[PDB]
Design a protein around this ligand. Structure first.
Ligand SMILES: C[S@@+](CC[C@H](N)C(=O)[O-])C[C@H]1O[C@@H](n2cnc3c(N)ncnc32)[C@H](O)[C@@H]1O
Ligand SMILES: C[S@@+](CC[C@H](N)C(=O)[O-])C[C@H]1O[C@@H](n2cnc3c(N)ncnc32)[C@H](O)[C@@H]1O
Lengths: 243, 243
């Protein structure tokens, strides 16, 4: 495979969501993407396979038990070999974005640590984790969805598996029928004029980015064409009434 | 159930990731959360159950076929009844954050439309969708993970199901053993001093937010205690060497 991803999770079966369906599922079956899981519960030794533990200092909630998680991590690292970057999914980590995705996609091996409960021991992060990554400024019940989100995002960059390409939102899309609930497809898209169609899409993208996410434009160095199309959109916007 | 979520997806089985595991899985089994899916493929009429279609204007990629998707949406709305907010998961939508999560959690009924391929017809968004939401500035292969991310996030706010609570990153956590690879647990956490422990956690949160996500603090109105603890952390930071 072009990319191998080790996963530490109490719920390995959750990953079937990406390994068994759609383009990512195809990628896995075709060995372009390999996802291997290790479950901390399999590394417990007590009768009830305990995987959580009490946080020092008290407070509500529990934490992942260190020993089972630590052993699971070590086993994954042994299976990965040298060169594998170990990531902990966490809202305290670097916020994921397309730029970060392409950066992570450069790794041929990754080990993703998925926490549950209130998280994991800080010392494990310092001694076992290379990088902490967040998929957004919100809190989820576990690191599994965040891990799958990361895998799915990077997988798109793996040759053969298959917006923001120019740091812009995508343009609107249209398919059959020509008229839907009285709404028609923009005439230009049905003209067959490749060049005009190209410009329409770029202009729409610039317009939509300007109107919905103006901040995204600030950190962007526009080409002469982009500057022109944007100015046209803004001029057209300024010649209209608005709600 | 306290919250009912309708889902339109070509891959209903992906949702087992949240309905069959962990706290969200418990919430579903206990009827606190209800997730019902409709698959556009079930609404096709041609021999091969086609669910994609060509985008007008050409260009690579396909789009969700309108008729099957539209019919799936209508059926969900009929099953939901009045009051259900229809959301389309899309990177062009409002970027999800804890504030948005709590806002969405106020809805007792939600219908989540999950796209595949290059997306869906813009006219469907205008005629069937109430709001567009994104889980982050990155591109995924489908709206299923984003939808599950949204469901998981909101589910945490449903009474009985169970960071950023104060707009701050969480503080470090520790559990057994007392010493891990030569690293000890901060003495204060094992002192039993509830008040000192409380202050340590708040201070750590402020410190971590300041160091990792300084922007998060700007849009925050600190309490006198928070201002004090932050100043202490910064003073302590300024009295040390740094790498
Ligand atoms: C309920 S959360 C724990 C939140 C906790 N207050 C903290 O300090 O991490 C459970 C697990 O899901 C992960 N998680 C939750 N939200 C996440 C996000 N936005 N991105 C990545 N991982 C996330 C956590 O890092 C943690 O391992
Ligand atoms: C490959 S994406 C299509 C990207 C396309 N360029 C666009 O204009 O939407 C396939 C599906 O996943 C959804 N999706 C991808 N990234 C997402 C995100 N960050 N948040 C929410 N939905 C997302 C899309 O909205 C779309 O329905």
């Amino acid at each position: 495979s072009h990319m191998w991803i080790g996963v530490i999770s109490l719920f390995p079966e959750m990953f079937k969501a990406i390994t068994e369906f759609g383009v990512t599922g195809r990628a896995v079956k075709h060995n372009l993407l390999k996802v291997e899981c290790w479950n901390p519960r399999d590394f417990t030794f007590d009768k009830h396979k305990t995987v959580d533990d009490r946080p020092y200092g008290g407070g509500p909630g529990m934490l992942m038990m260190v020993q089972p998680l630590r052993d699971a991590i070590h086993t994954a690292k042994a299976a990965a070999g040298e060169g594998a970057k170990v990531i902990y999914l966490s809202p305290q980590g670097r916020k994921l974005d397309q730029g970060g995705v392409t950066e992570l996609a450069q790794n041929q091996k990754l080990i993703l640590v998925c926490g549950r409960y209130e998280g994991i021991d800080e010392r494990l992060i310092q001694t076992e984790i290379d990088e902490e990554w967040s998929i957004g400024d919100y809190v989820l019940t576990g690191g599994e969805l965040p891990a799958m989100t990361l895998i799915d995002a990077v997988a798109r960059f793996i040759p053969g598996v298959l917006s923001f390409a120019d740091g812009l939102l995508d343009c609107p899309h249209y398919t059959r029928p020509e008229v839907l609930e009285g709404l028609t497809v923009p005439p230009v898209l049905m003209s067959g004029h490749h060049e005009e169609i190209r410009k329409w899409r770029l202009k729409q993208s610039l317009q939509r980015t300007w109107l919905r996410r103006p901040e995204l434009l600030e950190g962007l160095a526009l080409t002469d064409e982009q500057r022109k199309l944007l100015k046209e959109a803004q001029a057209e916007h300024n010649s209209l009434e608005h709600h």
